[PDB]
Amino acid sequence: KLHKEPATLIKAIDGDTVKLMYKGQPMTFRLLLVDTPETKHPKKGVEKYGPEASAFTKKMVENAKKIEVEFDKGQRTDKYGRGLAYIYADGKMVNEALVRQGLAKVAYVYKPNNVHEQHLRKSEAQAKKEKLNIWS
């Protein structure tokens, strides 16, 4: 089964990336299954809603009492060294919150890291129906 492990915030870096202290080591975490508009896009740069997604993730993790990380069932790091995880702030999944708010889309899914896929797709569908942010 998947289980959560505690972590401590170091710095929110962008909408889709946060640096955490995990098992006593600083590490960069990429949020699984979501694509946010980025402020730090490799080519693009600062896309529309980038600033908004980035501020949303930052507030959510900076104002939390407890941060937890949840790994999926496949690879736990990507080719850049970043942890691949679902991040929880006081019990609430940051990945889902972003999608629910129309501040992220569900990404292209590489099995078998897809455990919360349907759940996020349901939230994405609701944000589209409500025409929030990216979908407005």
DSSP secondary structure letters along 45-59: -S-TTHHHHHHHHHH
Whether the CB-CB separation of 110 and 117 falls below 8 Å is answered with: no
What is the topology classification, in CATH, of domain 1-136?
OB fold (Dihydrolipoamide Acetyltransferase, E2P) (2.40.50)
Q: What residues form the annotated binding site for Ca(2+)? A: 16, 35-36
Q: What does DSSP assign to residue 42?
A: S
Whether the CB-CB separation of 14 and 38 falls below 8 Å is answered with: yes
51 Cα distance to chain centroid: 15
Q: Is the dihedral of CA 52, 60, 41, 119 positive or negative?
A: negative
Domain ranges of the chain: 1-136
* Enzyme catalytic residues: 30, 38, 82
90 Cα distance to chain centroid: 15
- Smallest CA-to-CA distance from 28 within 67, 66, 85, 98 is with 85
